[PDB]
Design an enzyme around this catalytic site. Structure first.
Site, PDB file in Angstrom:
ATOM      1  N   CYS A 119      -1.300   8.040  -8.873  1.00 42.40           N
ATOM      2  CA  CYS A 119      -2.429   7.380  -8.190  1.00 42.40           C
ATOM      3  C   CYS A 119      -3.746   8.132  -8.365  1.00 42.40           C
ATOM      4  CB  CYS A 119      -2.141   7.191  -6.696  1.00 42.40           C
ATOM      5  SG  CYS A 119      -1.501   8.671  -5.798  1.00 42.40           S
ATOM      6  N   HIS A 173      -1.815   7.970  -0.539  1.00 42.82           N
ATOM      7  CA  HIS A 173      -2.064   7.129  -1.696  1.00 42.82           C
ATOM      8  C   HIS A 173      -3.558   6.871  -1.777  1.00 42.82           C
ATOM      9  CE1 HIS A 173      -1.763   4.131  -4.764  1.00 42.82           C
ATOM     10  NE2 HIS A 173      -2.009   3.117  -3.956  1.00 42.82           N
ATOM     11  N   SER A 203       0.160   2.620  -8.902  1.00 41.56           N
ATOM     12  CA  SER A 203       1.094   2.710  -7.793  1.00 41.56           C
ATOM     13  C   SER A 203       2.470   2.330  -8.304  1.00 41.56           C
ATOM     14  CB  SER A 203       0.718   1.775  -6.641  1.00 41.56           C
ATOM     15  OG  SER A 203       1.760   1.776  -5.662  1.00 41.56           O
TER      16      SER A 203
END
Lengths: 32, 250
Positions: free
Chosen positions: B110, B145, B162
């Site tokens: 990410c 994230h 992702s």
């Protein structure tokens, strides 16, 4: 000289990408 | 869990730790590793061309071009992140790490994708880029994230990478920043994740040689302790401040 470093980067790439396929297929069996 | 700090040709201690890890997690384990490391020969994987902005692309075509490059590099399931991103370095060095990503052409995660997304949009001044970070709860532990929020011609969207298709790119269709965040929230709902914390940065400068770092934490919201109407209230207030281009880093 810079001969063995470029061959080693290339095999490591091929190994990483082999490994990435099996890890991707694994993470879907677990997720399913 | 592990990060490669040794450059390219990955050192041996980092190499062995990658394999040792993957032999544990995999059921076939030591056999699956043996099959790769000892293979007499392996196909050289094709190298995707770094995307180039053409006069025939719309801004949506370009962001899809960049995003497809990222999807081709592939999300990194090996357990070892291959490029070190020091989040708080000046852009200039992150920019160099991004160039290195396009030369070595490995899988990314990410945070690497966000850095690379900044790199590939630096030449389009009408695209504004800001980081979006989530902290999430799932069945026991917390997860972090980050994606790259995009603002362009009155619409919001995102680039990223992702494990799940619904937590990466979003088309440039959201009329407000709240709508985009709430779509990530509902995307997380589909995987039983509860969104604890949302963090939004400032627009990133377009000069690839900037000395200043990325502001990742301009707005911070504990959305699990908040009702929908108050989250939207604060995001719209903050999004108005971004577009009016008045803010000073936190």
């Amino acid at each position: 000289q810079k001969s063995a470093q470029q061959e080693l980067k290339q095999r490591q790439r091929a190994e990483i990408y082999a490994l990435n396929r099996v890890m991707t297929e694994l993470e879907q069996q677990q997720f399913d | 869990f592990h990060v490669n700090k040794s450059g390219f040709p990955i050192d041996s201690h980092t190499w062995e730790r990658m394999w040792m890890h993957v032999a544990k997690v995999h059921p076939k384990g030591g056999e699956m590793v043996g099959a790769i490391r000892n293979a007499a020969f392996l196909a050289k994987p094709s190298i995707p061309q770094v995307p180039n902005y053409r006069l025939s692309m719309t801004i949506p075509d370009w962001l899809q071009a960049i995003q497809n490059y990222m999807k081709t590099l592939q999300y990194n399931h090996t357990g070892t992140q291959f490029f070190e991103i020091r989040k708080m370095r000046p852009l200039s060095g992150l920019m160099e790490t991004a160039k290195e990503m396009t030369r070595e052409s490995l899988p990314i995660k990410c945070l690497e994708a966000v850095i690379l997304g900044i790199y590939l949009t630096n030449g389009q001044p009408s695209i504004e880029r800001f980081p979006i970070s989530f902290k999430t709860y799932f069945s026991g532990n917390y997860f972090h994230h980050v994606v790259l929020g995009i603002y362009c011609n009155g619409r919001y969207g995102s680039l990223g990478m992702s494990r799940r298709a619904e937590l990466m790119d979003k088309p440039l269709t959201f009329r407000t920043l709240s709508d985009l965040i709430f779509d990530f929230e509902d995307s997380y709902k589909k995987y039983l994740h509860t969104v604890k914390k949302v963090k939004i940065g400032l627009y990133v400068p377009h000069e690839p040689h900037s000395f200043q770092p990325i502001e990742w934490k301009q707005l911070v919201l504990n959305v699990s302790k908040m009702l929908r109407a108050d989250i939207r209230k604060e995001l719209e207030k903050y999004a108005r401040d971004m577009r009016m281009k008045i803010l000073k880093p936190a």
